[PDB]
């Protein structure tokens, strides 16, 4: 069981490598890759931690060494923010990085499950998908846009409001991963009942959580520690499922029946080959159906943007 | 149970806070403080993780709000390295930071156990002690220098060499926290015998474990993630002992009988008021007894250096 992390030297990368080193099952292997020179050292730093998990770091323009024999590849490489670039700039830079890395993955470990964390996710898994097709190795069951962060913030906010135990709430979240494309199915949360005003407020807080962090760090960056935690959960769910465990359900952004959009985030049953079964989003409330229809256009443009990036 | 972390925005601090946010028992509270303005956002970032541990972060030059009601204070503030600064420069900077911070601790939460991570630990815990004395609130049972890092590194190297599972080895380390004052009692590792050569090699490596990480980072970085891990285990040990758990033993740098030096790291039984019992280092090997006496004068100066700092 070998897991590869691309963009390991970054905030999200270090918090993820750290949690994975101390949580992956024994015998498991962890390789880190990043263009930053410090990457081999990050690995050395983590190797001093006494767990049954081998770990190595690599730098350079070639990530082959890190990808060889990998069963899981988590991509958190990219850019969060830099002085001088705006909305367009970030996308322009992250799209290229994703294109390159998924490209190297296609040639090195085409059978690995790929979790993409790099934003914007709605558009980046599309780029990834298109890059895999042009190589003849695309398998929509093994391409996932990591949206777990939305799920845990929801669990947290709901627990806080209804005074529940944080670890007893599991809110399914569908749609996309940005502003109005994030849709928490608050109507499907066992036990708790919500007020229309609370569904309106919560939903708003969940959709803006990322921004809430950025403003708090005062331009100092975006969520890294919570995202690292979120990616870890997703990483282990995949490993567990890839190892034969039963009933591992997780919400992710995959290519399913285009009933709403080519790629949509919905409950998935994970197994030995990635997605085993895309599950029905079930019953939705008036508020939920309205929020859904009112965002399909936006999600489709995000996806469109992505496909156009590859196919020109 | 309120735990405070000073310097929470640094490399070590963020890994530490992350690990504590998810591992402190339910009901615990975590308050982060650092001069970096990004600090409250670090807390907001971490508050999005669903664990029953309340968290708040603060910045500015007054740690009071973070210190009020604190049961445990972990200090990791300081300077790992800055261009243009050499050995003595770093020391003066770190010495002054620990002085300023302990003083605030003395004023706001005088009965909290203090765990100093800032290096050089051999000198910094001495400084803290003096600061607490001059304020008239010193309690030698509640001040510790965190040396756990030397422990986990030893555990990892030993298992690797004698082919054991990383998690089943526990090497006691005594003395100081730097260079020659780090003495791993390899002779006490049950069911494992070593060659005067093995001991010679393991011992020198364990003492240079850090440098190993620095060189692997092309000179621009230090062991941050393994340190966060080590400080997490230490902190969790203190919390558990403070909650009344029995049998919690941990090697830490504290003041005891001046049998070897005023401050000496040795196994300790932790209890409800901090150090409850200072256990004997037990039986040493020839090599060990020999390494011990050979470093005593160095450790004593490290200590003298800290006492003279807080008096001129
Ligand atoms: N899915 C989510 O919920 C979510 C939440 C927050 C952020 N993100 C996104 O994840 C990414 C990670 O941001 P971060 O905070 O870690 O940023 P960061 O800048 O701290 O880390 C990014 C890392 O990428 C590395 N990198 C750059 N180009 C690379 C390349 N070609 N190959 C490999 N590594 C490369 C950098 O050296 C750096 O260490 C961003 O794009 C961010 O927008 C996703
Ligand atoms: N005990 C050990 O085993 C061990 C191992 C390695 C490093 N360390 C030491 O721990 C410290 C942490 O290093 P790091 O890698 O996190 O460095 P870092 O630079 O990443 O973090 C240090 C933090 O200290 C903060 N700080 C500085 N002055 C402050 C003040 N007066 N009040 C509050 N916060 C202040 C900084 O803003 C920064 O976030 C260093 O002194 C390092 O030498 C200890």
Swiss-Prot record, chains A, B:
InterPro entries: L-lactate/malate_DH (IPR001557), Lactate/malate_DH_C (IPR022383), Lactate/malate_DH_N (IPR001236), Lactate_DH/Glyco_Ohase_4_C (IPR015955), Malate_DH_AS (IPR001252), Malate_DH_type1 (IPR010097), Malate_DH_type1_bac (IPR023958), NAD(P)-bd_dom_sf (IPR036291). Changing residue 218 to R: In strain: A8190, E2666-74, E830587, E851819, E3406, EC10, EC14, EC32, EC35, EC38, EC40, EC44, EC46, EC47, EC49, EC50, EC52, EC58, E64 and EC70. It catalyses: (S)-malate + NAD(+) = oxaloacetate + NADH + H(+). Changing residue 291 to S: In strain: EC35. The active site is at residue 177. The keyword Amino-acid biosynthesis does not apply. This is Malate dehydrogenase. It comes from Escherichia coli (strain K12). The lineage of its organism: Bacteria, Pseudomonadati, Pseudomonadota, Gammaproteobacteria, Enterobacterales. The gene is mdh.
């Amino acid at each position: 069981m070998k897991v590869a992390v691309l963009g390991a030297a970054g905030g999200i990368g270090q918090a993820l490598a750290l949690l994975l080193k101390t949580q992956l099952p024994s015998g498991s292997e962890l390789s880190l890759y990043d263009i930053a020179p410090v990457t081999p050292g990050v690995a050395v730093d983590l190797s001093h931690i006494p767990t049954a998990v081998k770990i190595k770091g690599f730098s350079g323009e070639d990530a082959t060494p890190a990808l060889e024999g990998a069963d899981v590849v988590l991509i958190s490489a990219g850019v969060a923010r830099k002085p001088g670039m705006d909305r367009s700039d970030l996308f322009n830079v992250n799209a290229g990085i994703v294109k390159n890395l998924v490209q190297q993955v296609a040639k090195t470990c085409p059978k690995a499950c790929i979790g993409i964390i790099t934003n914007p996710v709605n558009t980046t898994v599309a780029i990834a998908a298109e890059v895999l097709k042009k190589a003849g190795v695309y398998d929509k069951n093994k391409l996932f846009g990591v949206t777990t962060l939305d799920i845990i913030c929801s669990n947290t906010f709901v627990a806080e409001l209804k005074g529940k135990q944080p670890g007893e709430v599991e809110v399914p979240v569908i749609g996309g991963h940005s502003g109005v494309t994030i849709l928490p199915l608050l109507s499907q949360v066992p036990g708790v009942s919500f007020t229309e005003q609370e569904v309106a407020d919560l939903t708003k807080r969940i959709q803006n959580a990322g921004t809430e962090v950025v403003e708090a760090k005062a331009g100092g960056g975006s969520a890294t520690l919570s995202m690292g935690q979120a990616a870890a959960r997703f990483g282990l769910s995949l490993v567990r499922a890839l190892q034969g465990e039963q009933g591992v359900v997780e919400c992710a952004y995959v290519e399913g029946d285009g009933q709403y959009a080519r790629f949509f985030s919905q409950p998935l049953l994970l197994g030995k080959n990635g997605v085993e079964e895309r599950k029905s989003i079930g019953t939705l409330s008036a508020f939920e159906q309205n929020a859904l229809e009112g965002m399909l256009d936006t999600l489709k443009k995000d996806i469109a943007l992505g496909q156009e990036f590859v196919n020109k």
